[PDB]
Amino acid sequence: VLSEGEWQLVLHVWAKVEADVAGHGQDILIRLFKSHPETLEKFDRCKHLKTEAEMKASEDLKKHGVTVLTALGAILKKKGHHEAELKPLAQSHATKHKIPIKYLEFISEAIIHVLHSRHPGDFGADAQGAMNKALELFRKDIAAKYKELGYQG
């Protein structure tokens, strides 16, 4: 459980993401793929890491980054009351895409990295810790739903 104050720190920095969801999404996915290139294998080959400029020019990558951050922002605004939003995400990510929790840890790391790089004034230790707790709760709850669907990843 997060405190109300911790939720507020989470949603305060999230409002900065909402000013430009696509740009944040691009930086987060580029960080993910550079730091953990194996995560490209969950998409069509082109399993090969392209240059940063090719990733920034990609209409498909920019769309993916907005798909992710739209869904995650709706989850964070529920302040832990997110069973109904996690249900369809667990369904697809466990049964169709097959995304292991360790890849959700990787993308959580990439989100925290970009938020710290772009908004340090809104992302000191207390806010970083609140965002860490919020993303740990997301991963814990999605993992329990994965198991309910028979996926142990």
Ligand X SMILES: O=C(O)/C=C\C(=O)Nc1cc2cccnc2c2ncccc12
List of residues contacting ligand HEM (CB under 6 A): 39, 42-43, 67-68, 71-72, 89, 92-93, 97, 99, 103-104, 107
* Helical spans, DSSP H, in 58-148: 59-77, 83-95, 101-118, 125-148
Structure-block tokens of residue 79: 């302040």
Q: Is 43 an interacting residue with respect to ligand X (CB under 6 A)?
A: yes
**44 lies in the site for ligand X, by CB under 6 A:** yes
Residue 64 makes contact with ligand X by CB under 6 A: yes
What is the DSSP secondary-structure string of 3-41?
-HHHHHHHHHHHHHHHTTHHHHHHHHHHHHHHH-GGGGG
Residue 105 CB neighbour total at 10 angstroms: 14
Q: Does 60 bind ligand X (CB under 6 A)?
A: yes
Q: Is 24 annotated as a binding residue?
A: no
Q: Which is nearer to ligand HEM, 3 or 43 (CB)?
A: 43
Q: Compute the least distance from the CB of residue 28 to ligand HEM, in Å.
A: 9
> Taking CB within 5 to 8 Å according to partner kind, which of ligand X, ligand HEM, none is near residue 120?
none
48: left (phi over 0), alpha (psi -120 to 50) or beta: beta
- Asked if 56 is part of the footprint of ligand X (rule: CB under 6 A), the reply reads no
The annotation places the binding site for O2 at 64
